[PDB]
């Protein structure tokens, strides 16, 4: 077609193995890379390669730019620009990262020295401790622009009689555990290579997911990564009833 300013290339990535899809046929998998803005533009028109006849599947449409950068670069990102001195140009506009990127060693992330705050609900690197993160974030729009470490302990309960002492006790430990929270967060982050604020403490499957995904990307295997969905992303064949899967 040549109409799109993208990069396509025939690839041999190892596909997943859905029980229904078993016929070998041939191999003509492709590796189309294309910026998301013109992808949204191409969503509009009827005729385009991504939506035409004889399309078997799209296999990694679920992964967001956030996940791509947190998996590729990591916490310790550095600039290998050289060429023309566009550091000022890079900082005034948005630094495009595809052309120039490198991931430096993160053996020591930070020698911590910074102020910490609180914000709690019982229905600057601030720590958000609320049952409803989304509601508090939406109600105060100014809360979005500040960096927050979101640690959520939820479902407060009351005996309905003499609740003042139990409120005091529930407040005391949350007041006094700040030194432990930050210490454990840094301890996990220094090995994890995920940035501190994106990472959560109780979240443990996320570490496994990122590590397994990046060590898979070291190989040619396809991720089948799927976001906030209980089923794997197999290209759309996963949306049909099958006896073996059942």
């Amino acid at each position: 077609q040549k109409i799109k300013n993208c990069l396509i290339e025939k690839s041999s990535a190892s596909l997943p193995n859905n029980p229904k899809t078993s016929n070998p046929a041939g191999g003509q998998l492709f590796k189309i890379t294309l910026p998301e803005s013109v992808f949204l533009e191409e969503k509009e028109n009827c005729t385009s390669i991504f939506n035409d006849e004889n399309v078997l599947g799209v296999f990694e449409g679920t992964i967001t730019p956030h996940q791509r950068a947190i998996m590729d670069l990591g916490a310790s990102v550095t600039f290998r620009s050289k060429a023309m001195g566009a550091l000022g140009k890079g900082i005034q506009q948005g630094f495009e990262m595809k052309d120039l990127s490198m991931a430096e060693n993160e053996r020591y992330l930070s020698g911590f020295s910074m102020d910490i705050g609180y914000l709690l609900h019982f229905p600057f690197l601030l720590l958000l401790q609320s049952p409803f993160i989304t509601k508090l974030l939406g109600t105060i729009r100014l809360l979005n622009q500040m960096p927050i470490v979101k640690l959520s302990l939820n479902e407060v309960l009351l005996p309905q009689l003499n609740w003042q002492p139990t409120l005091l006790k529930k407040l005391v430990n949350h007041v006094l555990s700040s030194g432990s929270w930050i210490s454990h967060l840094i301890k996990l982050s220094q090995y994890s290579n995920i940035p501190i604020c994106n990472l959560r403490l109780d979240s443990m499957d996320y570490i496994i997911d990122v590590l397994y995904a990046r060590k898979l990307k070291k190989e040619n295997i396809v991720l089948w990564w799927n976001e906030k969905a209980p089923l794997p992303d197999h290209g759309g064949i996963q949306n049909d009833f099958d006896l073996n899967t059942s």
Partner: protein, 551 residues
């Protein structure tokens, strides 16, 4: 029947029963019971003043009481309801519209030997069903596809063009030549070869030199008309032509079935007798067009997400305009959640079922503002793939076609904030006067595109193809039990032998359209939000529609 007399003197029925007996039991009617006789004493005593020697009054009262029993079927014995019919009599001196779910729809079998529909008693009414009464019996699994084949073959054999005729497959076991017209299920044998199956038997099919009739879809699990030659050296029917059974309009279909009240709003039918009615249809067609264009019911764009904030804001802006002119009916359709809700083993966060409950509590806040829309509008709730009970098993996939309504436990006070709200199954039938509309929500175009026969050899054409296949096959599920399981005893809900007058067929994978075919109208709402635009369409029972957009 009149008032203002002196006072209601009390008299014993012994001095009243002879007149009632002579008027009712002797001439027309019978069985004036003792309790019923005592009941008929009060109203005749209401105007008792200067009577039992008067002229017409008592005779006319008995005549009027007989009028109800000729009008209503009732029975023989007269019971304490005798006052209940006089309440109707004094009553004599919109409505008739209903929404029928999948479960409450009447069941009808078909006898091929008799060319007629036989009633099936509902197990809920007579069976105890205290512990397990919804569960089918194994015999339905054996007749599920036989019923489809009988209905389609009757229609094929009553077509005008056919009078070569369709031959049973086993009649081909000794022939070495000639031509045959075979009708049956297209599927794959357990060996992996394409085959055709009819109640008589089965045969393998060769597609190597087949020329299909373009204009529709050839998916496994549907009836197909085929033509070719049978070779006895092996067992193969070499195909030379392929088509689909022709469709039939509902006006010519009704006459064959008489005037059966399938979606009976005129009355109900039992194992004894059936119901038919013709004269009322003319007058109610008159009433449909009797300057009732004010009626206005609206189907929203499918797949609207409550958890998203922008969708909620757009819905508030839309209801802002809907408040001005309240729709007659408002159908909220599509999945109400953007993520399937399952057991959610992790309890650190709030449970997904509690989140489902909470997302149905913001609707009350957003709806309580607009009082008129509450006061004079009826809302119809359609489920979706990611609702509560189904997603607990399918995990967001599409499974059984008869999908039960949303549980009343997690949605309780939306019935209070709004006046008329009805929860309905995934396939439902709106009976509006002399009109039947079918509500169905699934992605049909994707499944058609994925599963095609692929014969070895502008986008709106696909919409016409989909409409023609769905309408000619006379069934909403042209698929085998493998692709989509079906509740065995509820399959009649999905069979369109009489073509509906108006069809609601929403598919997010297919662009919106407005097509007409043999006696029906097919509309496609879909994709509530698209290209930063929120769309919703209006339709009027006078066969005009409108599209209204609100960024």
């Amino acid at each position: 029947f009149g008032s203002g007399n002196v006072l209601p003197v009390k008299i014993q029925p012994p001095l009243l029963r002879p007149l009632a007996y002579r008027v009712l039991s002797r001439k027309y009617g019978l069985s004036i019971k003792s309790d019923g006789l005592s009941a008929l004493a009060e109203f005749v005593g209401t105007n008792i003043g200067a009577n039992w020697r008067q002229g017409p009054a008592t005779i006319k009262f008995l005549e009027q009481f007989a009028a109800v029993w000729k009008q209503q079927e009732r029975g023989l014995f007269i019971d304490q309801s005798g006052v209940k019919e006089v309440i109707q009599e004094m009553k004599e001196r919109r409505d008739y519209f209903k929404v029928i779910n999948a479960s409450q729809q009447q069941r009808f079998s078909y006898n091929p030997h008799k060319m007629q529909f036989i009633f099936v008693p509902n197990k809920k009414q007579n069976g105890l069903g205290g512990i397990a009464g919804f569960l089918p019996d194994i015999e339905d699994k054996v007749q599920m596809f036989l019923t489809r084949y009988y209905l389609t073959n009757d229609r094929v054999m009553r077509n005008e063009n056919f009078q070569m005729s369709i031959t049973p497959i086993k009649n081909l076991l000794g022939r070495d030549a000639q031509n045959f017209l075979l009708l049956g299920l297209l599927n794959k044998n357990f060996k992996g070869n394409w085959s055709l199956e009819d109640p008589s038997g089965s045969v393998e099919i060769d597609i190597s030199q087949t020329i299909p009739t373009q204009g529709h879809y050839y998916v496994p699990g549907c009836m197909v008309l085929v033509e070719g030659i049978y070779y006895s050296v092996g067992n193969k029917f070499h195909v030379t032509s392929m088509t689909l059974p022709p469709g039939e309009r509902r006006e010519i279909t009704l006459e064959t079935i008489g005037n059966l009240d399938l979606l009976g709003i005129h009355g109900i039918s039992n194992n004894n007798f059936i119901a038919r009615l013709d004269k009322d249809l003319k007058i109610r067609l008159h009433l449909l067009e009797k300057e009732l264009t004010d009626h206005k019911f609206v189907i929203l764009g499918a797949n609207l997400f409550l958890d998203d904030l922008k969708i909620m804001t757009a819905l508030s802006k839309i209801l802002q305009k809907l408040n001005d002119d309240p729709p007659t009916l408002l159908i909220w359709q599509g999945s109400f959640t953007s993520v399937p809700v399952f057991a959610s083993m992790s309890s650190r966060n709030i449970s997904s079922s509690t989140q489902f409950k909470n997302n149905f509590d913001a609707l009350a806040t957003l709806l309580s503002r607009f009082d008129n829309l509450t006061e004079n509008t009826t809302m119809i709730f359609i489920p979706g793939p990611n609702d509560l009970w189904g997603s607990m098993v399918s995990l967001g996939a599409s499974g059984t076609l008869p999908q039960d309504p949303i549980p009343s436990a997690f949605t309780k006070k939306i019935n209070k904030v709004c006046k008329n709200v009805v929860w309905s199954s995934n396939p439902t039938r709106i009976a509006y006067l002399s009109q039947e509309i079918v509500i169905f929500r699934d992605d049909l175009s994707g499944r058609f595109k994925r599963h095609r026969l692929e014969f070895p050899f502008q986008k709106v054409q696909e919409t016409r193809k989909l409409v023609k296949t769905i309408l000619d096959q006379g069934h909403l599920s042209p698929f085998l039990d493998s692709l989509r399981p079906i509740s065995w005893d509820l399959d009649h809900t999905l069979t369109l032998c009489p073509i509906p007058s108006t069809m609601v067929l929403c598919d997010t994978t297919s662009a919106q359209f407005d097509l007409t075919y043999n006696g029906c109208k097919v509309i496609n709402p879909g994709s509530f939000i698209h290209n930063r635009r929120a769309r919703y369409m209006e339709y009027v029972p006078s066969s005009k529609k409108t599209i209204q957009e609100e960024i």
